[PDB]
């Protein structure tokens, strides 16, 4: 595999997201780190699929709603950023006010 440090670092995000994903499924209102992890993993998989930066910047705002997260969490996350390898290399995705 020859995994570089950044690929291994992203495995941490992926795993943090598996935690949140399971909790959401049980019907829990997600907390701060859970929300960030869940929305971030979504975007990375978006790039894997080959979606464009512009598309993800939009789709990212429709992953979790204000009624799926704990009180105050939406305000604790003014935006979310994550990079991933798109077909045309690494690109930065910024989702402003992801939770509404």
């Amino acid at each position: 595999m020859e995994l570089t440090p950044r690929e291994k670092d992203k495995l941490l995000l992926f795993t943090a997201a598996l935690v949140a994903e399971r909790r959401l499924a049980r019907g829990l209102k997600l907390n701060y780190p859970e929300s960030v992890a869940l929305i971030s993993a979504f975007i990375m998989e978006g790039a894997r699929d080959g979606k464009s930066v512009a598309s993800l910047m939009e789709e990212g705002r429709h992953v979790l709603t204000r009624e799926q997260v704990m009180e105050g969490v939406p305000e604790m996350i003014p935006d979310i950023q994550v990079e991933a390898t798109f077909p045309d290399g690494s690109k930065l995705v910024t989702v402003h006010n992801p939770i509404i």
Binding site: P5, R6, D9, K10, L12, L13, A16, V19, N31, Y32, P33, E34, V36, A37, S40, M70, G72, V73, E75, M76, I80, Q81, V82, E83, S90, L92
Partner: protein, 551 residues
């Protein structure tokens, strides 16, 4: 020109009269003063103020600070104010108005070519915490504590050995020397405690001469009146502190006998409530004496629904764990009867929860008892100053290191913590040690900016090799310093010596000097102050908990 207050806060942080909520608690602070000159605030960025000839002067390195924290909202035992912080030579240079005297008025902190900038607008800045109850069970505790905002650690141990699991003792010259050397590898200020359980003075003097800054008396090694008196005698002659964990079994006598052996000499009583150890069930009464400096360990702070159930595993079980004293402790803290908070790392305490729990107690106390008699105005400023002092200045005073650390005062080592108001006491934005950032949250290393996920705490330059040595302190006893211990062991870090351990008393504890007429009922275990019953209700939910943590 003119600018609305809201826009001003969003740009330079809150000012006089504005209030800020601490994390997700009910505690609200209010800016008491602002040291700036409106319109002359320094801001960094493209086109901003800190630029050559503008907010940056033409002075040489010696005439300007090395680092400036702009628009910081300071929260310290002495005040909750807005100001710029200057740092020079790893120490706090000044708290005032930063800029260039060439074009700006009232500049007290000169910014020059040699000045690095940290933008603290909208952030809360505090001194680094000081935990005086560490069990050196593993070296990984330093990172955990540093990330939480504790920059100094005092305690003892030699690793995961039975002695250390149970007590805060680094037994003898060899182990003391070994730990002093290992300490250079840790990113926090350190001071060791030796085993003070001996009735032969020379055996203690050796340890003090070897390097320890205190002697921990623990019941597991025999906390007898003979042992206690012996440690206190050497302490009086070598200017070091004694930390006590009394005879829970009441084997050699009751609490009154222990107190009698102490004989009015200065001493720091560990976990004074008793759950962590001490004469059952009234060791708590010690907080009424002037020579006693009382602290609490964190697993009992604050009283909640699961506290009791949890403590049983963590005949004398029910005599040691008492709901009555556990509830009283929270109130005694709110009143200033208990002056310190500590962890008791991996031996009935959580290393990374000293700060977090202290604020949880404050919150629960406000909720249950309302405003303190000392409060002025519609804020919780006094309660914030009283509680922050518990893990900053008071621990520093108790162990004779307040001349080096403990608070944001000029001349002190620059151990600072930057917090975003929404994560105060929980997860720090920046942790500065000796003038350099030692640990901070960091995102994707390969990203185009430091913010993309995943963001987690990673070590910085202040935690690297020789830079770390230059930014940390190893506290020695006056004797060890004189014997040239640092040179003999070839210690690489900066050295500080302790002094003033014997002269501190309960009255010197900042905002926590209450000596209450407290009694404990031998049977019912009820705690009473002046006859009135002291107690509180167990919390079912707490702030700074499930909203911030992944596990």
């Amino acid at each position: 020109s003119n600018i609305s207050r809201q826009a001003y806060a969003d740009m330079f942080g809150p000012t006089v009269g504005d209030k800020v909520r601490l994390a997700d608690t009910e505690l609200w602070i209010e800016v008491e003063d602002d040291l700036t000159t409106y319109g002359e605030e320094v801001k960094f960025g493209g086109g901003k103020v800190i630029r050559d000839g503008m907010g940056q002067g033409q002075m040489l390195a010696a005439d300007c600070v090395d680092l400036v924290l702009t628009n910081a909202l300071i929260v310290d035992h002495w005040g909750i104010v807005k100001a710029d912080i200057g740092v020079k030579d790893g120490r706090i240079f000044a708290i005032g108005k930063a800029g260039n005297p060439d074009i700006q008025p009232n500049v007290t902190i000169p910014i020059g070519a040699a000045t690095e900038v940290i933008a603290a607008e909208g952030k809360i800045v505090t001194a680094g915490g000081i935990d005086t109850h560490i069990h050196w069970i593993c070296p990984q505790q330093a990172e955990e504590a540093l990330v939480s905002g504790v920059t100094t650690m005092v305690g003892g141990g030699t690793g995961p050995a039975a002695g250390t699991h149970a007590t805060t003792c680094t037994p003898g010259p060899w182990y003391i020397s070994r730990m002093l050397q290992a300490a250079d590898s840790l990113p926090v200020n350190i001071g060791l405690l030796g085993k003070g359980n001996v009735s032969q003075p020379d055996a203690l003097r050796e340890q003090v001469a070897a390097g320890v800054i205190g002697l921990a008396i623990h019941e597991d090694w025999g906390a007898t009146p003979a042992a206690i008196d012996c440690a206190l005698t050497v302490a009086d002659e070598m200017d070091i502190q004694v930390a006590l964990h009394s005879d829970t079994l009441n084997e050699s006598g009751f609490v009154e006998d222990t107190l009698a052996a102490i004989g009015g000499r200065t001493i720091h009583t560990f976990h004074t409530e008793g759950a962590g150890g001490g004469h059952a069930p009234d060791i708590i009464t010690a907080c009424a004496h002037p020579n006693i400096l009382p602290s609490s360990t964190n697993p009992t702070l604050p009283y909640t629904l699961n506290t009791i159930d949890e403590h049983l595993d963590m005949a004398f079980a029910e005599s040691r764990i008492r709901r009555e004293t556990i509830a009283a402790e929270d109130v005694l803290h709110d009143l200033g009867a208990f002056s310190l908070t500590s962890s008791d790392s991996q031996a009935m305490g959580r290393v990374g929860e000293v700060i977090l729990r202290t604020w949880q107690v404050a919150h629960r106390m406000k909720v249950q008892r309302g405003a303190l008699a000392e409060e002025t105005g519609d804020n919780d400023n006094f309660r914030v100053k009283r509680y922050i002092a518990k893990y900053t200045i008071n621990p520093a005073l108790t162990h004779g290191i307040a001349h080096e650390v403990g608070s944001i005062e000029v001349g002190k080592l620059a151990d600072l913590v930057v917090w975003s108001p929404a994560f105060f006491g929980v997860k720090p934005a920046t942790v500065i040690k000796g003038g350099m950032i030692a640990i901070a949250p960091m995102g994707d290393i390969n990203a185009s900016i430091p913010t993309p996920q995943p963001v987690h705490y990673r070590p910085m330059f202040g935690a690297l090799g020789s830079a770390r040595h230059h930014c940390r302190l190893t506290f020695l006893s006056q004797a060890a310093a004189a014997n040239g211990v640092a040179e003999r062991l070839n210690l690489r870090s900066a050295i500080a010596v302790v002094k003033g351990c014997r002269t501190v008393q309960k009255a010197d504890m900042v905002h926590n000097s209450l000596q209450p007429n407290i009694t404990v009922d031998a049977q019912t275990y009820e705690v009473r102050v002046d006859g009135e019953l002291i107690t509180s209700e167990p919390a079912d939910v707490l702030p700074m908990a499930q909203r911030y943590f992944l596990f």
